[model samples]
Target: TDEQIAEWNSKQEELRDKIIRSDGDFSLSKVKYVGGFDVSYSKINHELAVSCMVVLSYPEMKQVYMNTTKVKLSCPYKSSYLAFREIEPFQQELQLLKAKKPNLEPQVFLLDGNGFFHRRCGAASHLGVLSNTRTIGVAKSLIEIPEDGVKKTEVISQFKRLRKTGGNELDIISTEKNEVLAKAVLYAPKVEKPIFVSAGHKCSLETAAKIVKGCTKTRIPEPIKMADKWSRKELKKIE
Candidate 1:
């Protein structure tokens, strides 16, 4: 067991290294089609859940494909480990769809949750790493993140430092320099108090902010905002 734990530690370190190494080309400009993935489940009321996947074409912001799945898996409402708790069923649905379609891949993924900003890389990051997809944690609320160099009170425009050792990476709110509308502000259209922005697999925090801001024709990023609306529509229609 001790050896297995050591092996897992080594694997995590390797994964982190892979992500850091590939962070250089995080903004490849190849992402023309973007998609948002989110799940809405009644934790207590009806015990019903509908995981929704919504796709949109770039620049134009037109919704392309919409799909949803109902599952019996009920994820426990955990604090930092929400990824492990809630993300499995959604991932299962995505995997099943991908199995049928066979050749499907989005250039980037806008997850409706936090990314690397957790006790040990939050749900978004974990999911992105598993899928080997570029992901951004476009969370509705920020959670379990370190608070050191936060700029604004209700808004965040800076990255939270990773650690004191060799892990000095950015993973938080930030704004673009000399840009109106605070193009890179992380927690602008706040559902909670603020939102946390971080790299999921193959992006940096600055690039993450840039991509998110670039996607903002409306208040929230088009991909995620549309997905949220679409998921709610499904819930209303079905349950």
Candidate 2:
């Protein structure tokens, strides 16, 4: 078990080395499909509903594939440690992606949470890593980013710009003005907690972020938005 853990740590560090902390450009060639993930709960029934969807896109942003999947899971809705609870259902949804077998294995996965902003990069990133897909965490609430890095705008109030903390690592800094958000660590080189990002098998951080922007609508991305819709619908049906 210890050896397995050490191996994981080594692989994570390798990923950190591959991170490119730059803003990515949005081009049709860069992004193929956008996937959104979400979860809904039925506390009375002790059930969890996880939903996921991938929206295929071409040059004109037209929809190609709007695939979705849902599964029930029995896990407590705990805070901070939510991944294990949703793992089964999320894994089920991932199987759907494997079935359709898109032209490309998604340049970016629009996860319904944070990417490199969590202690272990959260469930979203964990799923991305497992699926070998580039994922972005589009969370409604602030998780972690340095106070100074948070910017408060009238709309899209909380956004962060990551800066180098040193040793080829990054710090989630705020670019907007007058924002007081929580500090979320980016899991990368030179930083402590689980490095939020680095080079995965396919994409880099800049590429991942770019794909995120490409899929986003007003605030939420198309994939994640779809996931939200499906998750709520499933909850209504079961409850």
Candidate 3:
């Protein structure tokens, strides 16, 4: 099993390297509809989960399509390979949603996971590449990318003060040379820390942050937030 796992991990890393970064407009103005995908596990049984995918009209942020699937999780808890388990169920649900409404097509997908900001490429990026869809990753916490090494910094600093002032924006950089890989965005005034936003596929970090801002109804962007909410609701069915 360990050998198989290693083989699978290597394959995923190769795919990660091929992830495309889009130079085209990823701004909210160009996005007609955006989607979000998230998965929630059963607390009582770790192997059980609810995978949800939701598409919403951009700017207005209204729900256009929503789908969920209950699955028995199979992939091991390897951080980099988490997408392997999460993607299949999500893909299935998304296909069903499309089948239900043949006219529905989302410009982008916001995944509640990491993207370029991961050990290899993030789970979100993996899914995006496989599906050939534009996606972005919005996470509540920052993930350490092994290739880039680690950048340990206090969440509170002069930069933090600038963010608090409401006029400034903070870019989360790589420790190697202060490369801006992702951004910390404060979507709601009540939240202390900003959520980390990263590009999954066919997007830049700046574009990902701006799109997240446009979709925010609270500290968490509405598309992903609603996906989380619907995921929790799906848990009851499996229970």
**Which of the numbered candidates is closest to the native, going by highest lDDT?**
3
Cα deviation of 221 in candidate 1 (Å)?
Answer: 1.4
Worst 10 residues of 2 by lDDT: 153-162
Give the TM-score (vs. native) of candidate 3.
0.89
Candidate order, lDDT descending: 3, 1, 2
Models 1 onward score TM values of 0.70, 0.60, 0.89
The runs of at least 3 residues in candidate 1 whose Cα sits more than 4 Å from the true structure, single-residue gaps closed, are 1-21, 24-26, 43-46, 96-104, 144-194
* Model 3 spans > 4 angstroms off: 25-27, 145-149, 155-159, 164-168
| Evaluation by TM-score, superior candidate among 2 and 3 | 3
Expressed as tens digits, the lDDT of each residue in 1-239 for candidate 1 is 35644554555454554453146654547777677877776645556777777667765768776677775654455465566555675577567646755344467778876665543365667777777777777665545333332344333323222222323223333233321111224334432133445667677666677667667665578878776776777777776
Q: What is the TM-score (0 to 1) of candidate 2?
A: 0.60
lDDT of 2 by residue, 124-147 (tens): 556655665555554555553443
- What's the lDDT for candidate 2? 0.50
lDDT of each: 0.59, 0.50, 0.79
lDDT of 3: 0.79
* Model 3 Cα lDDT, one tens digit per residue, 1-239: 78977887787778877787673755556789988888888888978988888889988999988888888887756766678878787788778877888577688889977787774478888888988889898888766664665444543464577765754457766767667667767777677766888888988888788888889888889898888999989897777
Task: Identify the runs in model 2 with alpha carbons over 4 angstroms from their true place.
Answer: 1-28, 48-50, 58-61, 67-70, 101-105, 144-171, 174-202
lDDT (Cα, 0-100) at 176 in candidate 3: 75
